Subunit: 267 residues, 4 copies
């Protein structure tokens, strides 16, 4: 297996459409031993994670909760064994209140909403790394999920701003993680049908949300030289597992695109 014998923490499962669910699934198929975290809906997440190929312990983690973060490393050590450390950590956590996305006016998002979105979507990448690095092996790998924010675009609005901040945070986490021999990278994915993608069509009434998703998928698949399927998270999941493996050992502070090549083409 690609990740045989590696112990990996996977955040961000909420439904079995979640990108983290497919990251966790491929990682287990490739021999990894997982620890999972879940936010808020722990009973529902526990049932969801039973659909994964192999059993894995589930820990509660709200990245806005400094008590959760401060106890996380010790809670991880309790489940993986006294003398054991993590080899990989997956950040697959994002949120932006409704006012910050969809057809809602960009100028009308109140700061309290945008700040919450920045906290969960960008600041928390530093928060999670700070919490887990003490229980990470040298040679380890932290990977976060990104959506290319180089250019502005409709509907993504303030979540785009949060991703721009996340990219910057990743470069600084790589400085800290490198002091202990750990890599830090983002995977910039093309669009995937998840709960997150439903936030993007927020405000659309009627068949508008469906047709907006149709236009998004059509244009992405068109630009991508090898095509793009928003219903298939497996290629993104594999890319994350590639970064969690030992096969990109000189890549850190970086962004690896898993978008079908769409961002390299203009029409």
């Amino acid at each position: 297996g690609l990740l045989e014998g590696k112990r990996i923490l996977v955040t961000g499962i909420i439904t079995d459409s979640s990108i983290a669910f497919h990251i966790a699934k491929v990682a287990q198929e490739q021999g990894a031993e997982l620890v999972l975290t879940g936010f808020d809906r722990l009973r529902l997440i526990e049932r969801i994670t039973q659909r994964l190929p192999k059993p894995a312990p589930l820990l509660e983690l709200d990245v806005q909760n400094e008590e959760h973060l401060g106890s996380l490393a010790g809670r991880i050590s309790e489940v993986i064994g006294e003398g054991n450390k993590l080899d990989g950590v997956v950040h697959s956590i994002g949120f932006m209140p409704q006012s910050g996305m969809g057809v809602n006016p960009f100028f009308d998002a109140p700061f309290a909403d945008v700040s919450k979105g920045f906290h969960i979507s960008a600041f928390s990448y530093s928060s999670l790394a700070k919490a887990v690095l003490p229980v990470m092996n040298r040679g380890g790998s932290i990977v976060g999920m990104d959506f290319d924010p180089t250019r502005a675009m409709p509907a993504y609005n303030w979540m785009t701003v949060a991703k721009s901040a996340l990219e910057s945070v990743n470069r600084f986490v790589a400085r800290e993680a490198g002091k202990v021999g750990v890599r830090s990278n983002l995977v910039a994915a093309g669009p995937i049908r998840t709960l997150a993608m439903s936030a993007i069509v927020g405000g659309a009434l009627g068949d508008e949300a469906g047709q907006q998703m149709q236009l998004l998928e059509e244009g992405w698949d068109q630009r991508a030289p090898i095509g793009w399927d928003m219903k298939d998270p497996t290629p993104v999941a594999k890319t994350v597992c590639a970064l969690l493996s030992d096969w990109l050992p000189a890549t850190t502070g970086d962004i690896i695109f898993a978008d079908g090549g769409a961002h390299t083409q203009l029409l």
Copy 2:
């Protein structure tokens, strides 16, 4: 003059070393009529702005204060005249608590501090645009100050993250401002000796060595050199973007850094 007859709002003057002070100075030399804003120490700012070439009214604006923002357009109209609008707006506002910069470890910056820095340095570019666009002419220009955050740097830490956010905010502000014929752009300046940039740093030998190497390297990398004690080239570049001479540039970043960012060594 380059800005003859243009009415321009300039935020961010705190001393005569402020970048906004030199922007305001050059803009007046080039025929512009200015309105200034000031945060917190208004009595001191009023006296400092008397050093500018020409008089300009001063309005209070704390960009975290929604009442200040919501009244700003009406307060601008009171000073420039009933039937008049602004042609330009300069955002030269930046702040990050000490926990988010310097020798303070990146991981130890509390969220409340970083959020305040994000508010003042990135979110407020949108807030300011929202407030002034109703009293801006078509063909107008909004310019903000940037420091290239494409790569991580020691000591700048969370201020670099805020600048990464600011670049993204500018691209979305350009979409809103473009609806009314207004451009929005950032000037990415090389390092300048100001109060805000001195906050980034006295604080031990590691911080001292980091900044010397940053400054040493910037003049070295820049093909035409870089003078950290001279804000004039940055001020002129902002005036270039306020003028009518870059009329098809918006949502963009213009570098006034000696060309340093184009060179590796």
Copy 3:
């Protein structure tokens, strides 16, 4: 009162009154600059075009593939501008890629000799022109070239896009050399400006599928641009070039300034 008052500026690249260089020259003269112009090959026709400019200007022959033309250019410039005078600005507005490299053949089928010629004219010659003119440029001068954003692949533009990527790299090295004598070097990345060659593709020169793609590509600029984009109006591009020729961007070099309506900053 002119943006370029008293400045002596060399403008290459005029072939018709649609040439971007023609509009650069027009605005620069309107802003008080004194121009020297260059033209390639059929100078008698180019001279009739340059008579349409607001003010008279000498025209010098320059084939940028001809090293004798390049080696004699500085002296020929000095002869027309006066013994003790130098240039303040230079505009490179020169580009060409043979048809095989811009869609008439598939990308893989363009012969190297054609592509090499396009690279020579469109990228290498920015270095060649800088070498030739820098001896007669004042400190504080400015060299500006024309770019078409090559960050992403596009239909039909093919090897010309490769040439522009090369030109962007050349500009960064010219900035190193020019900076030694106090001269800035920059590119203006313009949005598309209507031409006969690309109009032919939109007319169905490369078939109906390629025609639709080129038109969609062009239309997309005005759509993406937050302030719109007018493919028939080179004046905003001309003004931006004059802005880089002025003294108002004095700390910008090795760089790329976009005059594209903001299109490249937007994804839809």
Copy 4:
């Protein structure tokens, strides 16, 4: 193995320091069956390829030679078997005449020299793809070697221009290759001590250029959060093998950095 059962063409071996030699070594260790090509010094390359873990046929290929390119597919088919195709192709080919490098003035490099370097280092990435795509399986992978040309550098001079052109070529190759389900990507490596740059490193293209190359290497390891070892091509070879594998299946037209993270850091 990461490349088990895959047939891969590797260009660019000249000595056992070549990046291509280490790509070949790791690929064979990971189960790949290789075909190798060599330019000009075929007796030397034959001996060099005997140092690899496993035997591999060696084919002559001068990428400036259109006859070599036009016969290449058939010569590949002859050695891999009638009904078999390639799964991967590695372009590890670069050259710029001395006039285009070192202390030799950038403005003085004659066009004939720069055009030759452009042909070998950038155009031939398209030429090789054109030549090999007819004998490539769907789902295959083409990988070329890049040196980040986003910013100008001492001594690399016109080779940096060639790399900027190569990055553009890669995006158009990805378009064409994507039509038949093949990916095309570059690996931007940190500096590695190889034959091509040895004279510049040794001061033979000026004492100043030698000094600047040392400063470049020192700063590269300094910037890199996980360090950079200019004598160790293994992390680069592994990254190329990662792109040849099935684990980055949604990445094309792209550039993957194997540089210690140096390019993401300013000091």
